[PDB]
From a paper:
Here, we discovered a three-component monooxygenase system consisting of AibH1H2, AibG, and AibF for Aib hydroxylation in a [name] strain possessing an oxygen-dependent Aib catabolic pathway not dependent on α,α-dialkylglycine decarboxylase. AibH1H2, a non-heme diiron enzyme, acts as the terminal oxygenase in the three-component monooxygenase system to produce α-methyl-d-serine (D-MeSer). All previously reported amino acid hydroxylases that form hydroxy groups on an aliphatic C–H bond belong to the Fe(II)/α-ketoglutarate-dependent dioxygenase (2OGDO) superfamily, but AibH1H2 belongs to the [name] superfamily (AHS). Thus, AibH1 and H2 are α′ and α subunits forming an α2α′2 heterotetrameric complex that act as the hydroxylase component in the Aib monooxygenase.
AibH1H2 has a heterotetrameric structure of AibH1 and AibH2 subunits, and each subunit has the characteristic (β/α)8-barrel (TIM-barrel) fold present in all members of the AHS. Clear electron density is observed in the crystal structures of AibH1 and AibH2, which is consistent with metal ion occupancy. A metal content analysis indicated the presence of 1.96 Fe and 0.76 Zn per AibH1H2. Moreover, the positions of the metal-coordinating amino acid residues in AibH2 are very similar to that in PtmU3—a non-heme diiron hydroxylase belonging to AHS30—thereby indicating that AibH2 also has a diiron catalytic center. In AibH2, the two Fe ions are coordinated by side-chains of three histidine and three carboxylate residues (Asp25H2, His27H2, His211H2, Glu265H2, Asp337H2, and His340H2), an ethylene glycol, and an oxygen atom. AibH1 contains one Zn ion coordinated by side-chains of two histidine and three carboxylate residues (Asp24H1, His26H1, His201H1, Glu255H1, and Asp328H1). Thus, the AibH1H2 heterotetrameric complex contains two catalytic AibH2 subunits, each with a diiron center, and two AibH1 subunits, each containing a zinc ion. Although the His331 residue in AibH1 corresponding to His340 in AibH2 is conserved, the Asp residue corresponding to Asp342 in AibH2 is missing in the mononuclear AibH1. The acidic residue (Asp or Glu) at this position is conserved only in AHS enzymes with binuclear centers. So, the acidic residue is important for binding an additional metal ion to form a binuclear catalytic center in AHS enzymes.
Author numbering:
A (entry chain B), B (entry chain B): 10 to 66, 83 to 111, 116 to 375
C (entry chain A), D (entry chain A): 27 to 380
Amino acid sequence: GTLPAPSVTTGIVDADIHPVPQDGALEPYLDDRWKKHIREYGVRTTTGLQFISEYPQPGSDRELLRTQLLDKHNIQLGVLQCLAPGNPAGQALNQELAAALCRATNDWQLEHLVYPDPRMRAAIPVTFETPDYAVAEIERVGADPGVVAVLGTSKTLEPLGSRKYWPIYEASVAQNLPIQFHLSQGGGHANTGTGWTSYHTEYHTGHVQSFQSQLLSLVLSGTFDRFPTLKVMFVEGNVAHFAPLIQRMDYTWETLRGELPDLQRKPSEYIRDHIWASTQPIDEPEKPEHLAELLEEFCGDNVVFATDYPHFDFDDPETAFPRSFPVDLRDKILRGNGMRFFGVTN
Amino acid sequence: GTLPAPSVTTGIVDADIHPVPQDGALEPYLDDRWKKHIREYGVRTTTGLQFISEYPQPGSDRELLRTQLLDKHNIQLGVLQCLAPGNPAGQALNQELAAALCRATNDWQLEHLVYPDPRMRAAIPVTFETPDYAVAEIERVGADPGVVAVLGTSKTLEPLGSRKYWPIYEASVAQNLPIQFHLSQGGGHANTGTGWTSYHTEYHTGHVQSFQSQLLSLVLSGTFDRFPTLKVMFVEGNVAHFAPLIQRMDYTWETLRGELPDLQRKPSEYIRDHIWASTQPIDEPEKPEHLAELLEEFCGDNVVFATDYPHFDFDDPETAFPRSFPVDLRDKILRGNGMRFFGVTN
Amino acid sequence: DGVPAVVDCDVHAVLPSPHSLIPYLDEYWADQLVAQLAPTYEPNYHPRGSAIAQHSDASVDENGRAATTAENLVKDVFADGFTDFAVVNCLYGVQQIHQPRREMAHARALNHWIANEWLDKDDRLRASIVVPQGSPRAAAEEIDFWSGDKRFVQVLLLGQSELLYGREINWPIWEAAEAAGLPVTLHIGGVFRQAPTSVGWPASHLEWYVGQQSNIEAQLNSIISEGILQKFPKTKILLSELGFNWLPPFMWKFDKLWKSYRPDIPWVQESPLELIREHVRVTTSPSDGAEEAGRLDSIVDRLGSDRMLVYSSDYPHKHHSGPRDIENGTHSPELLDRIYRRNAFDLYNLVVPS
Amino acid sequence: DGVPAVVDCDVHAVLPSPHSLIPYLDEYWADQLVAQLAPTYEPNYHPRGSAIAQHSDASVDENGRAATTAENLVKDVFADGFTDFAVVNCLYGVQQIHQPRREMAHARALNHWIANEWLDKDDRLRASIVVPQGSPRAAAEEIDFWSGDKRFVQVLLLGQSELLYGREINWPIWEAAEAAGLPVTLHIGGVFRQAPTSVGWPASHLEWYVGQQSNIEAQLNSIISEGILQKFPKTKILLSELGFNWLPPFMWKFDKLWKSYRPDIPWVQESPLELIREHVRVTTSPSDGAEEAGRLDSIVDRLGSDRMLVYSSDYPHKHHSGPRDIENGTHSPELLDRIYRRNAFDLYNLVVPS
Ligand SMILES: [Cl-]
Ligand SMILES: [Cl-]
Ligand SMILES: [Fe+3]
Ligand SMILES: [Fe+3]
Ligand SMILES: [Fe+3]
Ligand SMILES: [Fe+3]
Ligand SMILES: [Zn+2]
Ligand SMILES: [Zn+2]
């Protein structure tokens, strides 16, 4: 029917909920043209595999998602991040197929979960590699009060500050929409900048790297100059490592700032109102007081909470923090910082 | 001042001339902003090297280019393909720098060689990886009667049929301009689709491969459907291997044509008026009659002659052909086919 | 003594599921399988439900898949009595397992599966050895391990490697193949640890499939230029399901630039034309239009050798032309004999049994 | 017996031109050099005319370049008398030569140049061994060759490899380093055989330079996960010119997921926290803001070890902070002693001479 604008009071933000989608779900929103195409070839992507990725590990299910997450821990805003049904959608090599699937995903998550329960709302997958489609689906649905962000991936064919993606950024914030980039495989390059990892420790910890490279590119691209309006977030990427990254950027900039004579501000200054970060999975330093220290060294105003329901490495909404974590800041990432990012009114 | 439209009569086409540019040449067309930038960092590209590439081997010089090429062999149209001064320009990682350099290259080759001698004309380098710039320089200069094609490279970050490049194709043929793609290093991927070659035999013969992959992509992209006007050419890529490629495409298409239900025509049918090919370096089969056979198996109407002056593997304009080469066809690639491609009137 | 047999040099077993390896793995890896809820490394080279995957006429199993049991392959391949032996290639993508010691372990389990459940079942089947390309010294150890079982008749490798097969890194595989008197075959498919072309990811599977001929040019150039054929001069290389019409233009440029750069690879004394005609063989399925009238006689002209082509049906894949339409391309009985029996006798020495 | 010396663990020689190797190559390679009109493999890591390339104060040569002769380096590095020994790293990109036997040959010529024209000239200099990463068995042979000359004190490797250094392929280098009692150092720079990030080519050199800390995380994760530290338990790894503030967040996630996936790498019994603190050392130049007040004492808290940091000036590069401003970050004399002399004594056993 019609929705209210997202309302945050009293209650906590979860910037990363992964809804559990059933098989017979996206076909009502999928033209036959693609249904038999998936029958014949499946969703080809950057692998040589038919089903798996590179590194392989109310009603329908609303109730299990309302009961043991949205009620268990008092969650009042949960942001819906659907990769794809049963391997992310926008990374399919057939980009026309990819667009149809996010089209279907967007329709379904709206029609089936956020409207039945406006506590949740959605970040819309778009084809970040065919910007024509990204802008087209932003205009299609990003006007809905049921859309709260654009959803991209940590891995892309070019760094996120490249100008291939600038058509998507205007579209996105010409709709007053922030963009989240969620941890991802594929993209077109190896796991690391120096090869494919072998063991699961390298794979899982390697996810941090792609975020480092994306942050640097977004800042030194001048992207947040040409888009002073733009607010982007890094999800399932581990907040703590960002602070020495940001620190090293500034220290190198001081010497080499002349290569980029257009970058209005000093790189770390761009963080203020452009770079947020989800908290899951929570960083666990050996001395637990380093966490708060590192959190505000990045930025205390730009860290949003997340569970990653229903993933195995989910964080209990307050067993996640260590012994004497600063209460002011815990409160700011549970409520205030997410509020700020998604653009709800105080 | 003002030029006549290119006029072909009596005389032979050379679709690949590499002009010999001096140091103090592009600075009159280069904003100071870039001059000191090149002083400080040089033209960074897809290497970890400061000067060399991955695989490293009238007046100013008009006279040597008029005398021993444009007069020696009666050449009446020579197409100017400047990579860059002293490593191609458009592949520079700083894409703003890259644009300025083709801007400068275009200005120089016009002001200094084609106007002083309209026998030559120019294919304008553009930044095939930042299409906004490509369209911008097409409109800037591609209207000139001194521009006869757009100039790209054999290696790109995505296959040439991708839609990243479609803004360049409309611009290009919305200016009645064909596009040449010249043999290239860099691009963003390895030498081959299965690794970096080691010895010079693999490197030099490997150049053929990138053209195979580009042809397939341009055809099965549906690109020549969405651009029924578009005429593209492959330069320094060896014509003969294309025919079994084209042949194998059709034979696989017959089985698998259902993956691409929009491709109006049968793949090899797209060659007719969309795929040309330079002849340098000439293919030398052990039995020399296989050449003509293979040449018309590709297409006898779409093969244009080239010397690659002043490169070491240049071909004498008629010591290049074997014993009893068909005279009709020799004549069609010397005069007729190039005429057809560049759009001169009969 | 003997007359060379008709050998189908490329037929396929399709692993029903990653569960079919559970009997052949250590307790440690086995538990891992059932615990990971068994990700299947089934490749996308011949997509499950595409047109190339299987024939209309093909005997199928419980779930409608062809070539998951030997009983079904044997019943189809040997029906008309013309084939004497078939060479089984199982393409299940153990090569795309990134965990090195898992790649090692599934490769061996895969080969145990082929031996016990296919080779043990029909004396008419032969197989290639799946090997963990990720770790070449372990791939060599896998080759040594099966060198005893002379029902295994070549070493399988994917058309798209991680590094080119001529790089020193990959020498143990050629040394091991040589030591065991086994040819190395490159079969279409890849590890996909980089984009499959020099210019990025192909959008369609049709684009990938056709285009994979480019990587084979790279590999032969690599293998020969780096000097595999002088270090390991008994080497034989069979190109399986990769076309063959692209070879003559490729070889002519190789020879031309060999002549130009001879001091750069001074160990290559014969021409790569002569080298390729002696050492490289290639299967006929797909024929890529060579089946069309006259085209097969002509391609042997441009190849300049009648010793290169070896017969295959690529069972159970569906191609535009069938296994024996290769005959509609030549008026030369002597050439058909070479394709059907004599050239493959160079690979395997398989004579007609009784 | 002895007191550990003040060792600058990262200073640089800049090859004047590819012609400076001509005396050290075979007749065959030498002719090749003068015949190719000598392509220079000078890297772009510190661009010739960028701000990081050299100091304003630095003694320069005929063409205005710093650090092309030992006389110029020695005169600057040892001016104020505080340094006892410096470790020379020559970054000329032989590693980016694709021709394998040329990479081999220039690497050795490079090392001959360092020995004869730098090490022979000042008993106060030491060097790392440039090695042909392309061919690891040959890189190991290069290591064995210079193991005699104990003026060569570590093995040099680029931060960005072709395959991660933990892959079996790369084991000969670690084995050779172990055998020769030499640490392996990873110095910023790369072979660039893939995009330098997981997400493509960085546009600016400033982006590349800062971002290269991501690849080092990958390498340590690789080196440790694959089990280099159990096969070769005497291994020491020095991270040169790569920052160090990124380590604690990295190590904490490693430890967290080690604890999660312990049966996947069952040879890693100690925690990667303990492993990294024992085996990895890192130079101080650039300090990346650790020079700022209090920041250096704090980073050793987050690293949880005072044994890791070793002093370097990165001569002749220009950084925001100078070699000794590292002192403005701690109120701990005991920690400065560890950085300036004691931690590097773990790498080289260099005591103060007389
Ligand atoms: Cl609370
Ligand atoms: Cl004539
Ligand atoms: Fe998540
Ligand atoms: Fe997750
Ligand atoms: Fe050329
Ligand atoms: Fe050329
Ligand atoms: Zn096959
Ligand atoms: Zn350094």
